[PDB]
């Protein structure tokens, strides 16, 4: 399917023999499920979000559906808020990103789908996330009005400040809405702009 990025990426996938809801996220590396019993055995890890980081059990070699499509691969489950489908099942199932549906760049999902961007007058490097509702950028004197805001994922939430109205040139594409600043380890695109330089994933 070719999949918009106007409403949030949800698919149902089933997975120990029980369906669940999950996002598409191309901002994760990994595939992330909330606190339910797989058969396999474990081991404890630690994985990091916006918030922070969160303490889960990795589980190897689990088969997945994911729309349809068969996945079998590393799962990690903990207190994630949001069902997450990342970077290592998305690339087994063929799925790409792709611009102005599919007329402009492709980007596979082999390494984390980072891109040049342009705001307030500086290039910076931001990550292509699927899974992020807004687009949040680091620590930037941004001159402006701005309101404060909290966001959320994984690990918690982080105090930002937000701006609308911003220009943003994410790989040549001209894009201008609102944009959170705040201190995270990565600039993050999300559906906000991704929706305006016509941004699909297909698989
Ligand atoms: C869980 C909530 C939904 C998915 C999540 C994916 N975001 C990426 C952002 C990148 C880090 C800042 C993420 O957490 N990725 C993790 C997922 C966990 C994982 N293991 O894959 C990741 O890749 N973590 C790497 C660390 C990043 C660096 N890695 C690297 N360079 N290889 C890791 N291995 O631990 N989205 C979000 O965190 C966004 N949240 C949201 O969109 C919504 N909030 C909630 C609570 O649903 C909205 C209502 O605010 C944030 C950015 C605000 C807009």
């Known amino acids: 399917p070719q999949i918009t990025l106007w409403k949030r990426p949800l698919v149902t ?12 996220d191309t901002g994760a ?6 606190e339910l ?9 630690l994985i990091g979000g916006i ?15 994911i729309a349809g499509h068969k996945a079998i691969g590393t799962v990690l489950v903990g207190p994630t808020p949001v069902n997450i ?16 549906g599919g007329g402009g760049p492709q980007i596979t999902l082999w ?37 404060p805001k909290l966001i ?6 982080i105090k930002v400040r937000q701006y609308d109205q911003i220009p943003v ?4 594409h001209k894009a201008i809405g609102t944009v959170l600043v705040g201190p995270t380890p990565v600039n993050i695109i999300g559906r906000n702009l991704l929706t305006q330089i016509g941004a699909t994933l297909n698989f």
């Not at 959320?152 to 939430?157: H, L, P, S, T, Y």
Request: charge should be neutral; charged fraction near 25%; glycine fraction near 16%.
């Open 13 to 24: 996938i089933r997975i120990g023999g029980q369906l669940k809801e999950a996002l598409l």
């Open 37 to 45: 019993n797989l058969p396999g055995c474990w081991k404890p890890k």
């Open 169 to 172: 040139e994410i790989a040549g």
């Open 111 to 147: 390494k984390r789908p980072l891109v040049t961007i342009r705001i307030g007058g500086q290039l910076k490097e931001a990550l292509l996330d699927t899974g992020a509702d807004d687009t949040v950028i680091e620590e930037l004197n941004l001159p402006g009005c701005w309101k």
């Open 85 to 100: 489908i990342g970077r290592n099942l998305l690339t087994q199932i063929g799925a790409t990103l792709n611009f102005c």
């Open 29 to 34: 590396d990994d595939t992330v499920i909330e």
């Open 152 to 157: 959320g994922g994984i690990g918690g939430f």
């Open 51 to 65: 918030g922070g980081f969160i303490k889960v059990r990795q589980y190897d070699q689990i088969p997945v559906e």
